[PDB]
Swiss-Prot record:
Function: Binds to activated (phosphorylated) protein-Tyr kinases, through its SH2 domain, and acts as an adapter, mediating the association of the p110 catalytic unit to the plasma membrane. Necessary for the insulin-stimulated increase in glucose uptake and glycogen synthesis in insulin-sensitive tissues. Plays an important role in signaling in response to FGFR1, FGFR2, FGFR3, FGFR4, KITLG/SCF, KIT, PDGFRA and PDGFRB. Likewise, plays a role in ITGB2 signaling.
Domain of life per record: Eukaryota
Protein name per UniProt: Phosphatidylinositol 3-kinase regulatory subunit alpha
PTM characteristics: Polyubiquitinated in T-cells by CBLB; which does not promote proteasomal degradation but impairs association with CD28 and CD3Z upon T-cell activation.
Domain comment, as recorded: The SH3 domain mediates the binding to CBLB.
Stretches assigned to the SH2 domain: 13-108
Tissue: The P85-alpha isoform is widely expressed. Expression of the P55-alpha isoform is highest in brain and skeletal muscle. The P50-alpha isoform is abundant in liver with lower levels in brain and muscle.
Family under the similarity heading: Belongs to the PI3K p85 subunit family.
Quaternary structure annotation from Swiss-Prot or TrEMBL: Heterodimer of a regulatory subunit PIK3R1 and a p110 catalytic subunit (PIK3CA, PIK3CB or PIK3CD). Interacts (via SH2 domains) with CCDC88A/GIV (tyrosine-phosphorylated form); the interaction enables recruitment of PIK3R1 to the EGFR receptor, enhancing PI3K activity and cell migration. Interacts with phosphorylated LAT, LAX1, TRAT1 and LIME1 upon TCR and/or activation. Interacts with phosphorylated TOM1L1. Interacts with CBLB. The SH2 domains interact with the YTHM motif of phosphorylated INSR in vitro. Also interacts with tyrosine-phosphorylated IGF1R in vitro.
Organism in which the protein naturally occurs: Rattus norvegicus (Rat)
Length: 111
């Protein structure tokens, strides 16, 4: 019984662990809505870093992973950027953090 439930590993927007330099290439044109997920914010509840464009600049708005999962609006159970992004871009980014309301509506990927 091969139960092949592939929710999220490599979305056409998602990265995981990168720098500013490939955030320079993806956050080039933009001023709003541009997710990717870099490193450089790893300590308390959150390893990788949902860097979002705000008025021309790459602002690191890091995920609530806790140990390694996904769930910001959820009690640490969502487990997929693809559904932790469907629910968030079609609603509000004041459900994640109420200091911004954009809603991840312009992410990039190289070409």
């Amino acid at each position: 019984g091969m139960n092949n439930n592939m929710s999220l590993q490599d979305a056409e927007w998602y990265w995981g662990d990168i720098s500013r330099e490939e955030v320079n290439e993806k956050l080039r044109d933009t001023a709003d809505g541009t997710f990717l997920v870099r490193d450089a914010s790893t300590k308390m509840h959150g390893d990788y870093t949902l860097t979002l464009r705000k008025g021309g600049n790459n602002k690191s708005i890091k995920i609530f992973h806790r140990d390694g999962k996904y769930g910001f609006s959820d009690p640490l159970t969502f487990n997929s950027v693809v559904e932790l992004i469907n629910h968030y871009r079609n609603e509000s980014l004041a459900q994640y953090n109420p200091k911004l309301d954009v809603k991840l509506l312009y992410p990039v990927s190289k070409y």
